[PDB]
Every structure is written in C-alpha cells, then in structure tokens.
Amino acid sequence: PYTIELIQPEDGEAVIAMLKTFFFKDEPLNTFLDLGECKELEKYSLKPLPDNCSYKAVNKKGEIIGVFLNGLMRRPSPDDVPEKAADSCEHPKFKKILSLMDHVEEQFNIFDVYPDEELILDGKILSVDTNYRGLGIAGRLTERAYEYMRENGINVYHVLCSSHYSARVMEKLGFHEVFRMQFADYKPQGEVVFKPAAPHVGIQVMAKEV
Ligand SMILES: CC(=O)SCCNC(=O)CCNC(=O)[C@H](O)C(C)(C)COP(=O)(O)OP(=O)(O)OC[C@H]1O[C@@H](n2cnc3c(N)ncnc32)[C@H](O)[C@@H]1OP(=O)(O)O
Numbered sequence: 769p770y771t772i773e774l775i776q777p778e779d780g781e782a783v784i785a786m787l788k789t790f791f792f793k794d795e796p797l798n799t800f801l802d803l804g805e806c807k808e809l810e811k812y813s814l815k816p817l818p819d820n821c822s823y824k825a826v827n828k829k830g831e832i833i834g835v836f837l838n839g840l841m842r843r844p845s846p847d848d849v850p851e852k853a854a855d856s857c858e859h860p861k862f863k864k865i866l867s868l869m870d871h872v873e874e875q876f877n878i879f880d881v882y883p884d885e886e887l888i889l890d891g892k893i894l895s896v897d898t899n900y901r902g903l904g905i906a907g908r909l910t911e912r913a914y915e916y917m918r919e920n921g922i923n924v925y926h927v928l929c930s931s932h933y934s935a936r937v938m939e940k941l942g943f944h945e946v947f948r949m950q951f952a953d954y955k956p957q958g959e960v961v962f963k964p965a966a967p968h969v970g971i972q973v974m975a976k977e978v
Contacts, residue, residue, distance in 0.1 A: 770833060770905070772912045774799065775822040779832075779892045783817075783824065784810050786832045794932040798869070801861040808859045813837055821889065821916045823909050825896070825976035836909035838916075841890045843879045864961060868944050869928070871956055873969060876947040878926045881975070889917055891927035891974035894934070907941050914978045927974045931964070936973040943974035 851931035
C-alpha cells in the first residue's frame with residue numbers, strides 16, 4: 769500500500785538519501801562507472817524540484833520508495849546560445865554522463881519533433897526501491913505527471929532512457945522511441961566510452977503525447 773505525492777522543497781534531503789541508496793548505485797551508467805560520491809548528481813537531481821511536477825511514492829511507514837523527478841523544458845529562443853552541461857562539471861565520471869547527454873542533444877532536438885510545442889515535460893530521474901520493483905510503481909509515478917500536464921496544457925512527455933531496460937518500461941506505459949544511439953556507436957573522441965552489458969544496448973529517447 770503506497771501513495772503518490774508531490775515532492776515538496778523540504779523533501780530534498782529525503783529524496784537525495786533515497787537516490788544515493790538506489791539510483792546513484794544502480795542506474796546502468798552510474799553502476800558501470802562506479803559513480804561514488806557525486807555532489808554534482810545531487811545538484812542535478814534537486815534542480816527540477818521547484819518546478820512543482822516531481823513525484824514520490826511513499827509506503828505506509830512514510831518512507832520514500834520511488835521518485836520521478838520532472839522539469840519543464842522550453843523551446844530554445846530564436847537567439848539561444850547553446851551550452852554544454854559537461855563544461856561546468858568537475859566530477860570526471862559524472863562529466864562522462866553529462867557529455868553523453870550533450871552529445872544526444874547535439875544529434876537530436878525533441879523540439880524539432882514537435883514544432884508547435886513551446887513547453888515539454890522532461891522526465892529526469894526515475895528510481896524505485898529494489899524491494900518495491902515490478903509492482904507498477906514507475907507507471908503510477910509517470911501517470912501522475914499526466915495530471916500536471918492536463919492542468920497546464922502540456923502535450924508531450926519526454927524521457928531519455930539510459931538502457932533498453934528502462935525504455936521498455938516507458939514503452940509499456942505507451943511512450944514510443946523518438947531517437948536511439950547504441951553505446952557501441954558513441955565514440956565522441958574516436959573511441960568507445962561506455963561498454964555496459966549487451967542487453968542495455970544504448971540510449972533511447974522516449975516520448976508520449978498525452
Ligand atoms: C530518466 C531516467 O532516469 S533513465 C534511468 C531509469 N532508472 C534506472 O535505470 C534506475 C534503476 N531501475 C529502477 O529504479 C527500476 O528498475 C525502474 C524505475 C526503471 C522501474 O521501476 P518499477 O516500478 O520496478 O517498474 P515496473 O513495475 O514497470 O517493472 C519493470 C520491469 O521490471 C521487471 N521486474 C519484475 N519484478 C522485478 C523485481 N523484483 N525487481 C526488478 N525488476 C523486476 C519486469 O520485467 C518488469 O516489467 P513487467 O512488470 O511489465 O513484466
């Protein structure tokens with residue numbers, strides 16, 4: 769028995785504590801790199817909270833057992849000055865992850881897919897406690913965002929998935945692929961950077977129009 773609630777600002781510490789136990793250790797790229805202590809990922813995770821569209825799953829005892837942290841993304845301005853997230857990161861392992869994100873954005877702009885949309889919801893960090901996996905919590909967190917989207921006239925939910933494992937969860941929830949890149953093909957300076965196990969196969973950007 770669990771509830772799905774809006775993450776409040778005072779929940780920051782508890783959200784980070786939960787993510788340090790799970791996501792920091794067990795998201796495929798984090799685990800592949802052995803991310804360790806990573807204040808930059810704490811910062812990255814906390815950033816979207818004041819957008820007021822991030823959700824926690826909470827068990828009967830009041831413990832956070834899952835989160836889906838979301839942020840609003842806005843179409844680049846006509847005069848936009850594009851920036852690389854990796855440039856401002858001093859943590860070498862997390863910088864590899866941000867550089868992969870920057871690379872995806874250089875190859876693929878979700879706003880090209882949806883020329884009429886000015887605001888899109890971005891699903892940034894999704895994590896469920898191991899003892900509560902396989903129960904549909906990721907789907908219940910995801911679907912709570914549809915309520916926010918309705919209330920605010922947002923049509924598109926965009927989620928960059930770091931493995932085919934998490935892309936399949938989004939597919940089951942009615943998302944479809946809009947971009948993919950195999951890890952075997954990500955060679956930004958001429959050589960492979962990420963070589964997780966075969967089943968992960970690479971990134972997939974997933975989208976749903978709700
Ligand atoms: C934007 C991003 O954050 S991308 C990165 C996404 N996050 C991660 O990779 C972090 C590590 N993974 C996790 O935290 C979780 O596996 C999640 C969040 C991806 C999925 O959460 P869940 O609430 O377990 O999702 P769900 O209940 O749909 O289960 C997904 C699949 O896991 C498998 N599964 C079944 N039981 C379990 C279990 N005990 N433990 C693990 N996986 C299980 C099944 O294949 C299941 O699919 P199915 O139920 O449709 O057959």
